[PDB]
Subunit: 166 residues, 5 copies
Amino acid sequence: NEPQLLIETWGQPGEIIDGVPMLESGLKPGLYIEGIFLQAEVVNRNKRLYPKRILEKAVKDYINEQVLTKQALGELNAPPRANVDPMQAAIIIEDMWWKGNDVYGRARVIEGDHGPGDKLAANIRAGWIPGVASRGLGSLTDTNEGYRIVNEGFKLTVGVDAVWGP
Amino acid sequence: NEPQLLIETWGQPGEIIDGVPMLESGLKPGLYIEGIFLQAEVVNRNKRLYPKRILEKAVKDYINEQVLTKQALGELNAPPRANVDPMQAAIIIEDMWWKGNDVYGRARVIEGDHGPGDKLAANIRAGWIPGVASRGLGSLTDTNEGYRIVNEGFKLTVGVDAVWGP
Amino acid sequence: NEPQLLIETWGQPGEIIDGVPMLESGLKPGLYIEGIFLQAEVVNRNKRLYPKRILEKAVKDYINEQVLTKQALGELNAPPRANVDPMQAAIIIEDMWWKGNDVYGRARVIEGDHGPGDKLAANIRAGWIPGVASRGLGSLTDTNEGYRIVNEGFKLTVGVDAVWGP
Amino acid sequence: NEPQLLIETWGQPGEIIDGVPMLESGLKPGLYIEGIFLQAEVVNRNKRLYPKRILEKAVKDYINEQVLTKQALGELNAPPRANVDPMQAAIIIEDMWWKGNDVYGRARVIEGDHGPGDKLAANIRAGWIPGVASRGLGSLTDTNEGYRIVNEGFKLTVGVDAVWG
Amino acid sequence: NEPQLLIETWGQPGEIIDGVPMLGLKPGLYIEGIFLQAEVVNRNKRLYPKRILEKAVKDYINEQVLTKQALGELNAPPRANVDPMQAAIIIEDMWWKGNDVYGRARVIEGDHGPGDKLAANIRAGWIPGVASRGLGSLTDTNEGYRIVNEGFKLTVGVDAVWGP
């Protein structure tokens, strides 16, 4: 079929790290979410499978276009749009890497904004463990086996939104 | 009948505890609401009765799926939705337990969010005693005795929202 | 006629008291609005008169049902709704008493909420003297003398909203 | 015509005064906007003229009804309504006076509200010089000279909203 | 065409400067770099001729920058003028370097609003893009881009935007 917005939930990343004083070459503490942000070659909660070669290409382009350019914002709740709204940004992805079929990453929670970043930080400090969701643009092929395969050309547009796990 | 959103009010929990420094392994104080969050085997304010077997099963699943996974958020006002919106979260349930036919629990008010958590905390520190409401999915059978009984399969989706009692 | 929402404006209470350290059973300061909150036996700005016996019963019920139970919240602006929305609460009434044909009261401004309470407090500390409005449910009888009389059964649902005085 | 909402823009007041510790009758600092709030007998940006007698009456009634009673709030942006919404208040007028054909005033910026007052104060401290607008109720007469004259009975309902000029 | 709203994105300005105490002393968070470009086909497939942009920038400096009115927002809205309740930056200066218009914008802090949102995003590491708003018309060239016609008016020099 034709290209559509593809929103996926990927579970709760296994590490939340608060208050580590990081060097800014001058120390800045931060609240970080770190762990699995996306997964290849598995049927996910939306009954979709991302082939490894396709997600490798999408992640590489997203790293080059957004992460390394310091634009890889994400929101609290995954809205039905492909772009992040910086007024609604709650996190920024600092790094992503592969470990087998899993995409790991590290995201910093935006604090001091009197908005979604502070809301996310306060939820986390009250004990919330967030889920993460990704947003992208692509198309699906049905398999007649109860799931869909993402077609070549998938584009990752937001690596992580923080979401309440279903 | 068919499955519907079931929102119930359960009154005002009997304890509000502010500022006790709790062990975080450091110390973090917190504002807590503790008391009756749900009741079985009584006709409630909505003329509904929750059989004990059905609510035991729903509470057990909610503890495993949301409380123990650190996902059991609640809001300020009970909205006509089955899901909690984390941008609107005001509390998180830390524990639930049975005492006879009553479900007790302990909920932490989310502070520092410049949102519903801080609104709830400020209302409470001004003297407000909140009521609590639960949200779930189920169906009802009529009894011809002025109340309805919740059918088997009831699912608890939000244990506590803070609400203004009528 | 049939029961309707009745909103009345009652003018500006004569006392604003900031920062008195009150005993807690240490000390908590507060910002208070104190003075006339309702009036019986006068044609008010809406050309309505509240008979003393009807307002006496409505005030007694409101004190027992809302003030003493710590539920007597009010908002900033009087909305076209019978009950207070706790997300929009700006004050809580701590006490009400009679003086002649006037209902006096003391209301605490909710502070620390980053919401309507802080907004009200900041307006006041910049010099605003708020007006107050009440909300209730009742019906009216016309008199052919240019005003209407509140009928038996009037129910007071919100004793005070802070409002901009006309 | 018939009575309508009249919103006017009057430019940028010439003085912004930050932090002067005033005797609270303790000390309270404040952020103030001071200068021309309305003008009589000039064709303004809306091609309207306010006669001096009509504006004198409206200003006196507004001083007596709102300023002296501590109700003379204004907002950030001028909304299409006659009355101020106190949830959206950004300033309060403390004093108004005449100087020739100009109405001067002093307005305090509301601070600590986590709302439009703090927004206005933050804009001002970043360097913004606000414009001001007035709101009132009245009617207009056409003159066939390219402007309209405000008719007798004009009522001033909001002395100052802070606006982008 | 007839006069329409023209919104352009111009990329990420190259310098973000936090905390320099400027003359009492007030620190500030500043965005500095390229705010507009002449004589290039931009991301919207539009080219601004230099003389037309020179006239628009001069008028904007005289009408808004020097009068302390040159506010901008976070996100570029479909409106010609800035809403001060949504202001996130103020332009303090603009200057030319070749075909590029440079500027200095101060981030509005303490507002518990878009200004604090922008500053907090930046302190978390965001490098914003910038967009300009103005009023003008376009001529098609049949070569895959449009040229801005004479009379273009610059109404908002900089909004902070998420770069595509």
